[PDB]
Amino acid sequence: YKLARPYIADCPNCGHSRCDSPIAIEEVRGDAHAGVIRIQTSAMFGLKTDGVDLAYMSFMNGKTQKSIKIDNLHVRTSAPCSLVSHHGYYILAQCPPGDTVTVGFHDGPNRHTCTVAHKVEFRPVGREKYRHPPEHGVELPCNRYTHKRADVPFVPVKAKCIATLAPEPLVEHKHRTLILHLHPDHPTLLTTRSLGSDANPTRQWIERPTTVNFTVTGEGLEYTWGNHPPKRVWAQES
Amino acid sequence: YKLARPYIADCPNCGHSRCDSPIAIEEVRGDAHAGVIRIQTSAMFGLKTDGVDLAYMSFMNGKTQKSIKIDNLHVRTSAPCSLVSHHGYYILAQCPPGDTVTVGFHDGPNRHTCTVAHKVEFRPVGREKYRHPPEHGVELPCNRYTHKRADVPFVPVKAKCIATLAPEPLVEHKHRTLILHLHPDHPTLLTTRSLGSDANPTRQWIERPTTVNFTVTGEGLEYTWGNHPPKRVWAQES
Amino acid sequence: YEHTAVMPNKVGIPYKALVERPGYAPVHLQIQLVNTRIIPSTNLEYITCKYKTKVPSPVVKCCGATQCTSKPHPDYQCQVFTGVYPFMWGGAYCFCDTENTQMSEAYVERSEECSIDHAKAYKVHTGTVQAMVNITYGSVSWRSADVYVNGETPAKIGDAKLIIGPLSSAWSPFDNKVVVYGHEVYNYDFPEYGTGKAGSFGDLQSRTSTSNDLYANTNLKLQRPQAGIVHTPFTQAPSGFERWKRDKGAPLNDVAPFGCSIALEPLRAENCAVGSIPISIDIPDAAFTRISETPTVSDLECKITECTYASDFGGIATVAYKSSKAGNCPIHSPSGVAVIKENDVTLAESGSFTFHFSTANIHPAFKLQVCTSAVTCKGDC
């Protein structure tokens, strides 16, 4: 879980300040469409010399074995990044890329920055990829990790991550025709099929205010409009 | 005049997970095509306890008009930055790109630093917007703002920013016909109309050695090469 | 009384049908397909997913050869490179300049996230189809009854004895080979288990990928170690699963050709929505009064009080009539582009019943039948 004590690892690019540094990433795991990254550092977070804590870390510096509170030692990808949970050799944090993770002290010895290029995994959901959770409505499948403080790695777990939306589709039901006035701010996959007594296998990519007319039998249609899961009507308005 | 009191405000990223900063940027105006920035901060710059100064600012942090020197609280990109003028609640400064401004105290282990990613905005001022200042060309009117205060917000103004220039439309005279071999080194908008009886209503964006031939009636034509307002030639072999 | 009606494969709109036999007491009949699940047997062929390359540390023998052979565990590939590093040069300063040998090994595994962020290659064998057919008999509006569509057994449920003559997805919109990504489902055909593919789906294969016991093709191609450094260089063709993510159709769930909400993993087609569904409904004679009321409905007229252009249920109309005896009438539209909202009509001696209807027509024109008399309505709107 948080067994044994931290160690150093070779930083691929560091200053002349250090190189044999702490906080030198081994792996990062993604597939998140949230802004979180699961990080495996040489240094152990969630463990100080006192054993298990929730907001303290420990590190072998290659010069000293010491622990601190997370403050002076900040993770960044340009700007600071705030961790969420610690599981020993693994960190789970909010810090969106994870592709490169740069951990540096701008308080602790010299001006240290280690930047690490290391393993990542990321995947489309099957509509559009995103890594921003706003507060805009509907969510889509994503990956996240557990917040284990006890049983080393935080296991992968499915989760729901908010996706960017855009001005909602003006649906107009009409006679045998349902026109979908769409107004994306962001590329949306419009996948449709009619419902009721018809069904259309129709993918189209949309972006910018457009109209897309579809047949309907008087029995609606489903339209999935990217960054949303199915939005469907079965109206007799159709 | 300025009289809007200093305040503290939450800035997304400071320290590690620190966010309880003063001096935090709320809004930015980047109307300039130069690398100067107009900043709206919670903290009031250009006012100490003595009232209006040119090299002091004030902030709260447990205070209400407590002041320090503009070098103690130092602006930075990833190197120091010196402000130029204070207009109370608004700062105006030179910071190398004017697209990243970080106002920070790098005093002690608690390191509050707010950063807002500032912007440079280019908008029509000729018949086209234009690029950031370079070695090439000469200064032209640009969108901007005042770079000294009134003794609270800085006001918009047209000032002068270096335009990227490159060879202007190299006119080649022929029998009442002008082919314009134009050789940009940068994205220039070529607008034309004839100033003869005819007209040549043509906006086109050009980059690099190209030709654009125009008709004339032997009575001139205009070519605007964007970043300038209309340039006109009249009945040469035009 | 058996009444066989045809319901649009539609969810949410109850489809009105008549148990009609005037001179008894016709029974209110509304059938709503709440859900249809085509559930086929899914035989998992293999997991395939985004690999993570694992490079073991290279076995270097200074002053001796290093031997390795190909191994079938994932796409483990090694290569023996001889005379790799001279003396006073190379990543190791080996005394022997020609007997220095590096074996460069690497292989692919599944990603840690593969378990939930992995795809599943499925063979599809014959299923069962359940259909949730809500058949109402008697003046209510709901019952909801499970019934086998696929040839198994007739629904001997008390809500009405239902035989569902083949649904408009009595088989799922599935091929024999279906990819489930466990997010979105695609009908996508791939090679049978036993051989992977590099630069297309099935880059890792294994009945269940564990990280080993896989058969893969990722086209791992060892390169000779660059001189002056110890390194284990390799090239590879595109990750074939990832290539499939970059070269797959529209999410079949969202474009299904039968209007089915195709759902993952145990593949099944939920809530199909194309065509119309034969429904055989046993409404017993017991849900009519046996010639003790006589619905003989005569002098019936339809006046539409209001109707709205092609609407959900914007139709308001009234049927005035004379009946010999009081009763209960199913008021229906045998269409699927029109249903009557009501499905009861209060027969009385000089009875008048205002019913709400739906049509999808420009001017809502629906045929209503009560017990004995039927009309088609048009009127004030």
Q: Residues C54, C107: contact at Cβ < 8 Å?
A: yes
Q: Residues C329, C26: contact at Cβ < 8 Å?
A: yes
Write phi, then psi, for C289 (nearest 5 degrees). Answer: -95, 135
Q: Residues C118, C49: contact at Cβ < 8 Å?
A: yes
Please spell the DSSP secondary structure of C190-241, one letter per residue.
-PPTT---TTSS-SEE-SS--SSS-EE----EE-PPPTTS----EE----HH
Q: Which of A10, A160, A193 to mutate to test the interface with C (most CBs of C within 10 A)?
A: A193
Nearest by CB to A196, from C181, C248, C336: name it.
C336
Instruction: Give the helix/strand (H/E) hosting C20.
Output: none
Q: Based on the number of CB atoms within 10 Å of its own CB, is B72 exposed (0-12), middle (13-18) or buried (19 or more)?
A: exposed
Neighbouring chains of C at 3+ CB pairs under 8 Å are A
Q: Is A74 in contact with B16 (Cβ distance < 8 A)?
A: yes
Collect all residues with Cβ–Cβ distance below 8 Å to B44 and sequence separation of at least 6.
B2, B4, B5, B6, B7, B57, B58, B59, B88, B89
- Grouping H, G, I as helix, E, B as strand and the rest as coil, residue C280 is strand
Please spell the DSSP secondary structure of C285-353, one letter per residue.
GGGS--SSS---EEEEEEEEEE--TT-SS-EEEEEEEEESS-EE---B-S-SS-EES----EE-TT-EE
Q: Based on the number of CB atoms within 10 Å of its own CB, is C155 exposed (0-12), middle (13-18) or buried (19 or more)?
A: buried
d(CA A142, CA A129): 9
**Strand-pair category, B51-58 with B36-48:** antiparallel
**For chain B, the helix, strand and coil percentages under 3-state DSSP, each to the nearest 5:** 0, 45, 55
Q: Is A79 in contact with B115 (Cβ distance < 8 A)?
A: yes
Structure tokens given for C333: 């539209």
Q: Residues B75, B100: contact at Cβ < 8 Å?
A: no
Nearest by CB to A202, from C12, C255, C312: name it.
C255
Q: Residues C198, C242: contact at Cβ < 8 Å?
A: no
Paired with C316 in beta bridges are C306, C356
The length of chain B is: 238
Breaks (C-N over 2.5 A) in chain B follow: 151
Q: Residues C330, C20: contact at Cβ < 8 Å?
A: yes
Task: With beta carbons under 8 A apart, name residues in chain C contacting A198.
Answer: 259, 274
Q: Is C117 in contact with A143 (Cβ distance < 8 A)?
A: yes
Nearest CA in chain B to A73: B16
Compute, in degrees rounded to 10, the torsion defined by CA atoms C231, C237, C242, C244. -170
Q: Quick one: DSSP state of residue A154?
A: P
Task: With beta carbons under 8 A apart, name residues in chain A contacting C50.
Answer: 121, 123
d(CA A225, CA A180): 10
d(CA B158, CA B146): 9
Three-class SS of A79-119: CEECEEEEEEEEEEEECCCCCEEEEEECCCCCCEEEEEECE
Among C residues 143-202, those touching chain A with beta carbons less than 8 Å apart = 181, 183-184, 186
Structure tokens given for C192: 């049978």
Q: How far is CA B237 from CA A133, B179, B191, B194, B233, in A?
A: 63, 11, 20, 13, 10
Structure tokens given for A155: 């296991």
Nearest CA in chain A to B107: A107
Q: Is A82 in contact with B17 (Cβ distance < 8 A)?
A: yes
Q: How far is CA B228 from the centre of its chain?
A: 17
Please spell the DSSP secondary structure of B156-195, one letter per residue.
EEEEEEEPP-----EEEEETTEEEEEE--SS-EEEEEEES
Q: Is C113 in contact with A218 (Cβ distance < 8 A)?
A: no
Q: Is B17 in contact with A73 (Cβ distance < 8 A)?
A: no
d(CA C298, CA C292): 18
CA nearest neighbour of C345 among C299, C280, C295, C381 = C295
